[PDB]
Design a protein around this ligand. Structure first.
Ligand SMILES: Cc1ncc(COP(=O)(O)O)c(/C=N/[C@@H](CONC(N)=O)C(=O)O)c1O
Ligand SMILES: Cc1ncc(COP(=O)(O)O)c(/C=N/[C@@H](CONC(N)=O)C(=O)O)c1O
Ligand SMILES: Cc1ncc(COP(=O)(O)O)c(/C=N/[C@@H](CONC(N)=O)C(=O)O)c1O
Ligand SMILES: Cc1ncc(COP(=O)(O)O)c(/C=N/[C@@H](CONC(N)=O)C(=O)O)c1O
Lengths: 316, 316, 321, 321
């Protein structure tokens, strides 16, 4: 049926099965969040927070939304603001991919950059001062309950519906705000307590597991602090994945499965594959693919990529 | 429900209503083909041709598919080949966006570039020689019946279903192979003969309307010849749209409606808006949005875009 | 997502594969129209005619709609009328199942019965006379272009979308108004001309094939005249099917596949199975199942059905019969 | 897309807004479980218990399933059995509608009737005795965790997805096994604790509220015992609803909204309308409609329904009464 707003297409993303990448004795499925109009799982948060704000009477047309983002939320919030009539200002580290900057501008969002080495803790402070200075609305994605709640009601509902009456042993996800991890983990806990909730962190930014943090290349993951929305109790397995393995796995997904996703997507799949390798027969795992690989053409995901004609190849 | 192959998510794209861009006395809807896994309407063709080929016994695993493309079909065919186990070689003009080249490489496709000024006629000749030389399978998108047929069965079926029992006066589309135009126009003709099928061409490459052709910036449209699959009779209104107006309209779609699409998408919407302006009250129009704007960050769609912090703006 | 009206759930019915009834070398799929809110394919026509009439300014709130029906259209129009604020009067043969009378009544419809043996030809005259006397709107299901048109746009679109990129050899359907056969048949002609369009008639009511008609038991099919909306050119195979075989096939569907459908439904499947029997390996067929079997409890579909306890069966177990 | 089995169409039922029955300052939505292939919410339990049993190695092809049911579960298990290759035996009170007996029979199920006045307590004993004597599998719908679990994963997920980002104040449902109330109630507790969970019982069978039971007419609800799967903690409002009001509300739904549902369906809506009457403006309520009204043709839902021609009404028109 026809849709009124493009915002009505958010959510209800497909879960597809990996055809060759999974170890023969297992089944690995992936939730493709790039089907979201904004091209990432951040669409869920963006809509949730704005709708909740409107309901709270904190958002009026023409108002300005300011937020510290690693990219995807800035894009999504910019999209929502363009569609619903709000202004948007993204506070983002200068090391995040240029695509994110362009996409944010594409939806008409403003852009405030800052030294990426300060991490999200630094950006949050900036976004906070700005809001205080100009009276802008703060989305506070790392502390806003509307973040994980939307995941409890949609992301969780999609996964549970799709696997109803079916076997499912592991759910793998990385975390930025931990909204996805918390919201889905809290529903899994009640509906399917047997499913192991696996939470990975970049090997070089293992905050929860090692109290460590350093800039990294798995954009979207590991802020330099523990987010307020996180319900630590939902985690069964806390593991790490290195950014190079993540990059290499995203590549495999594209060339071996026809699925082009981001670095974090390659991280979760790589983790899922690791568990699968030494898991019992029949084991079924689900990994989240947060965004499209399209906003990573300028990153290390394409190191070594040949943009010229294959005259050498053809030579053979 | 769960999906087996990512290829099972092709088609069934949303048709959304423009909230502010349409003249108050009208309704403009848009079919967002960027929801296709490959991010463009080309996914329909790619799958169709490969499945038809397999059925014909012309395609076996490991076989190599070669095709002359303006980009999107190369990406899609590369995607399908990665998922189904085929090799792919794209013949593409060197003037098409770098994103297309990267995306094709992302799915593991080979890349053969040639002087863009030769247009698709030149690329077709190249792809043909290569296939003859190495025995590769030729998709022949400009002449393959499987191209418009898939549009007759899906694209057309989605539009008709969504508007069943509803008013619809104009259907707007541009054309490359003319597969979309032909296939949907042929079904509209039978089911809703009253709907005007509007076919636009770039002002500077009006082949059908003026027998003219010149390189242009509306990537995906106007090859330098009349495609074999074209059923000229389905066209009611043949109009032109300039590439700058198309670019400006795509921008508006993004910043005013939250819809980020390609140049051709801005072209069709601009045409639809033009008709709407001087159309009777109640007039309902549908325009196709062929692909995501994400593969256009390096094109003129972003001329003048500021990639730096808004210190100037903040200054105020 | 949430629906505003119950009428927004009309259409988009599932097509499912038969798991054990089809010959091994073939595949038989069925379109389950019982999934429509009204319980049958009639919902598509009812909504279409009403919407069309509204856009043409022929219908206004409180207006009365009258139609001669074999049952399902009466049920559907009643449902649409109840949802949209209209009054409905059904003109139905007295031999159609009582479930039909009760369903029409449930939605608030009125009932005008007439001697069934007169066929729909007789019913249309009554419907026409009532309209002229009271000014009621006539759906004219046998001549209204809005009938086959909704099938070209929805029923046909769902079928083509589901089979896109897949093998489909035969499309099987019976006909009453022929709106289904004409609407789908015409779209199939343009997009998949290779598909064989098979239209069956009851063995005892081969009106189109031989100009024969007699009251029959495959409720919903074969009126005693050739409907105006019919485009005979879409038919590749015009066959017959006897009511008993149809009845038995409906029974088999419910007990062997868990699909409970009406008589006309058993008819189409029966025909499809007949073609599948002598068809080449790989042959794929699609059969229409117009309605739920639940409005046939009082029909010969349940002749011999035991409503009592299986005391005898239970005893048959203890022993060694 | 194409479906392999009819059982793959179970669940994902539409939720629609009532257009004229709700008080102006409120919004009442209803979950239409009739859209399930079996015609009711029972399909979710039937599939779940069977799938669970299969994964636990408790069910093998040709195995026999036995269950005491008020009807719908018998119909559904019969349907699943017919589709999956199982044998089914229903143990049902003799007072439940004959449509239930016929439907079970249609899918190939067996029927064991017993004096209705004994309630499901009496039926379970019979079911248990039969199983022990013949080794049949017991679905144990009142104690099987697979019941409420399928509701947490599907029914609740559909509700939450549809209302995500939207206002929802009350969730209304009655209960038989309480699987629906417990499964949905528990997920609502975690995701939307603000939503008021309203569970009603028949005025004459307030077993949970006052420990009272008497045979009643709201078929499907209130067994004469408190089910083991019940998690009483999910209930915020425990109310009653009389069968007549429920019956009248089902009538109103079909005639005023074009939605034809059973008695328990009329009950939930009635309760919801009652709460809506004195609720603040903007209040949004959701009511469960467990099944189609088509298996109630022989019940008091149709008391006073005229199966004859409206000759009198037609005459009433010509005159000036
Ligand atoms: C590609 C990708 N993968 C996984 C996640 C994590 O999702 P959440 O845990 O937030 O739910 C995100 C989050 N992206 C959010 C938060 O990232 N900010 C950080 N880490 O400081 C944003 O766009 O601002 C992501 O962009
Ligand atoms: C962005 C966008 N918009 C509209 C169309 C036209 O669609 P069709 O007429 O082919 O169905 C296309 C076609 N893209 C095809 C054909 O383009 N080749 C040309 N024109 O020489 C390809 O990717 O190779 C497109 O990439
Ligand atoms: C159970 C079932 N099966 C097949 C068909 C045929 O569908 P159509 O050819 O009309 O599209 C119908 C038609 N039912 C219509 C027309 O029936 N009138 C006749 N045949 O005299 C009605 O209810 O009025 C049906 O109720
Ligand atoms: C029409 C309708 N409405 C509501 C419910 C209650 O649903 P549950 O609470 O069991 O989930 C049911 C249950 N029907 C079940 C249980 O009924 N047995 C009782 N109550 O003694 C069955 O068919 O066996 C129903 O058939």
């Amino acid at each position: 049926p026809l849709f009124n707003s493009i915002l009505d297409t958010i959510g209800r993303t497909p879960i597809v099965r990996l055809q060759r990448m999974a170890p023969e004795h297992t089944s690995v499925y992936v939730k493709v969040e790039s089907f979201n109009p904004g091209g990432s799982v951040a669409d869920r948060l963006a809509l949730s927070v704005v709708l909740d704000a409107e309901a709270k009477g904190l958002l009026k047309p023409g108002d300005t939304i300011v937020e510290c983002t690693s990219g995807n939320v800035g894009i999504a919030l910019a999209m929502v603001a363009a569609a619903r009539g709000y202004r948007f200002v993204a506070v983002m580290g200068d090391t995040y991919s240029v695509e994110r900057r362009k996409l944010i501008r594409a939806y008409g969002g403003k852009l405030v950059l800052f030294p990426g080495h300060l991490g999200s803790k630094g950006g949050n402070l900036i976004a906070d001062e700005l809001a205080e200075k100009y009276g802008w609305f703060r989305a506070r994605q790392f502390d806003n309950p509307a973040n994980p709640s939307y995941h409890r009601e949609t992301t969780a509902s999609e996964i549970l519906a799709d696997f109803a009456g079916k076997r499912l042993d592991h759910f793998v996800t990385g975390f930025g705000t931990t909204g996805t991890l918390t919201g889905v983990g809290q529903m899994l806990r009640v509906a399917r307590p047997e499913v192991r909730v696996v939470a990975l962190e970049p090997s070089n930014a293992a905050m929860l597991a090692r109290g460590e943090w350093s800039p990294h290349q798995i954009q979207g993951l590991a802020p330099n602090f523990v987010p307020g929305v996180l319900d630590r109790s939902v985690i069964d397995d806390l593991v790490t994945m290195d950014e190079v393995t993540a990059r290499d796995t995203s590549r495999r997904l594209a060339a071996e499965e026809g699925i082009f996703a981001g670095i974090s997507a390659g991280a979760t799949v790589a983790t899922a594959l690791s568990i699968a390798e030494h898991a019992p027969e029949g084991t079924v795992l689900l990994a989240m693919l947060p965004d499209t690989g399209e906003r990573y053409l300028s990153t290390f995901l394409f190191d070594g990529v040949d943009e010229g004609s294959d005259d050498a190849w053809l030579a053979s």
